[PDB]
């Protein structure tokens, strides 16, 4: 019994930070909006503190990985894939930082907004929305891989 | 046997929105901060963009939940448990629409951002935060209810 319960809590932990990395593409989607009477209305560039707010989820990511990394009887190949999707986050918080000229001025404009947080926009992606990228692709092995664990402990049944 | 694949899946659309929600708590730490070189640090107001970002996000977990509402076998009581937290996050959403010359302006000050997405503001909740706080309150009651019905397909196997 405790073999399900320890995959189940382990996707919970997996599902969790699929979804705040996702999340990011609903921020994205706030790049050059305001709120509007009817709702989201554009109201283009002064997205600093949207890309503040991508940054904290990103980096609440990273520390949920952190804990993840350190729990016992996890399999090494399981642990290896959950670093990759750590080295990710990493990557993007520090290249976000290394770009605080362009993101944490009084005036980011929309373009500038979207090459750190818009994985789907056709430009740059220099500013942290490759890493993001990076992090997508990470996130979503290790659900899989998590999810089928899931399901091979409710075969065993 | 049908419960196990269905409960999962259930309970992994109700871990979906929840985590969603709490990312709100990730946002409202952005308040009032840039991104710098080392981090987050203190850069007050304009906040405007971030809030948007918050709305964009509520605004998917009202859509995952009117989907949800539409799911193959949901029995009554949990469509109601459902119908609870879609109350609650359209609520949020209205509120925030309605509060568009204080949230859509061009600088949304730090205690005026935190009366709509920060639930520990210890000022007044009157843009938004109190309909989150009410959402939280649902969506954890969904979540319980949805990792109860989790544990009892397992047990019966």
Chains 1, 2 share one sequence.
Do not use: P, Q, R
């Amino acid at each position: 019994t405790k073999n399900i319960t320890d995959a189940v809590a382990f996707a919970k932990s997996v599902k969790d930070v699929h979804t705040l990395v996702k999340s990011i593409d609903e921020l994205a989607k706030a790049i050059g909006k305001k709120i509007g009477a009817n709702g989201l209305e554009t109201d283009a560039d002064k997205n600093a503190k949207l890309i503040s707010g991508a940054y904290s989820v990103i980096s609440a990511v990273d520390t949920k990985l952190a804990s993840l990394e350190k729990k016992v009887g996890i399999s090494d190949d399981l642990k290896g894939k959950i670093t990759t999707v750590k080295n990710a986050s990493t990557s993007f918080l520090t290249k976000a930082k290394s770009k605080t000229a362009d993101l944490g001025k009084d005036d980011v404009k929309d373009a500038d907004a979207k090459t750190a947080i818009d994985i789907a926009d056709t430009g740059a992606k220099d500013k942290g929305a490759e890493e993001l990228i990076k992090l997508n692709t990470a996130i979503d092995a290790l659900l899989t891989s998590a999810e089928a664990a899931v399901t091979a402990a409710i075969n065993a049944l």
